[PDB]
Amino acid sequence: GYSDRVRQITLGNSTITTQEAANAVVAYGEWPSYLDDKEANPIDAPTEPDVSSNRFYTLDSVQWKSTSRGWWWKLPDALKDMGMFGQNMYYHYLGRSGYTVHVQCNASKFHQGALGVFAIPEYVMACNTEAKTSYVSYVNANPGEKGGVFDNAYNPSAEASEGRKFAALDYLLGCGVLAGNAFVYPHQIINLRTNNSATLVLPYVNSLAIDCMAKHNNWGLVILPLCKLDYAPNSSTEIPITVTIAPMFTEFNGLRNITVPATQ
Amino acid sequence: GAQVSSQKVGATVNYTTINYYKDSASNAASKLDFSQDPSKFTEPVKDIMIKTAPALN
């Protein structure tokens, strides 16, 4: 008796299990694939690292509290220092990838709360100074695997240099649109009474066949508490949310010396 | 006497043309000429040089 509540995913040398899933999403109905000869652009023989890079890398966990406003990551950025995927990314000018995103959050039959898990193409967010526009530093735009957080307040900085970061305002989805409409993006919900995981399979999405990964993040991953965490015996409690992501059908072009981005 | 041709592909893909005047000079632009062979400028040598062969023996 196969339920869609039990599921296994194997990629490379990594496997994931879940016994309280809620189906899985294939973003825009399309599984990732390699780049066709009839849609190709750069002409050098590409590198397809296969299992070395196409595997489940597991980010640092975050804590969900009743006060938490949300979390965000960008993609290929969250994986930029993850094993061999990171090396292939930075040694090449060009790269493309799909993803299997697995968000993990278990609790108990006596907890309650609901997380919206959204995969957003071209997740451009607002900057935090009103002295300028489109004014975000590369370092703040690309936090890496630690990601960032949403806030329920918008306090743009006076002097232009202090707010070269995202104004991740939760109800405006960090980008001037109401968060309640984020469901037009590929999504699942982790509602603690129903499930403990979300699984999204993402194809490459871009206006090009292949692009510069160190310049450009293709997907944003957003986790918003839609209904806040609550647990009667101790409402100050916290449960972890763990994000595990696997690149898929990775393909790199334009090999040279290694890219080392600035860190300040 | 109307000529019908393919138009340049953009982002019902034919267009009609009728010449209204009695002198060819009056006509609109010549239809795309994809002729080319740069050999007369890039390789105007008397004896054929095979790429994979040495240019000088």
């Binding site: 000869d37 002409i43 023989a45 | 105007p44 790429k51 040495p54 240019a55």
Partner: peptide, 27 residues
């Protein structure tokens, strides 16, 4: 009538040396 496509090639280890020529020829 398009510009040229690129074929799938791999490496070589050959006495055929297309990388070398002699532009003295006028070519």
């Amino acid at each position: 009538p398009t510009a040229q496509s690129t074929p799938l090639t791999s490496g070589v280890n050959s006495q055929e040396v297309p990388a070398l020529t002699a532009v003295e020829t006028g070519a």
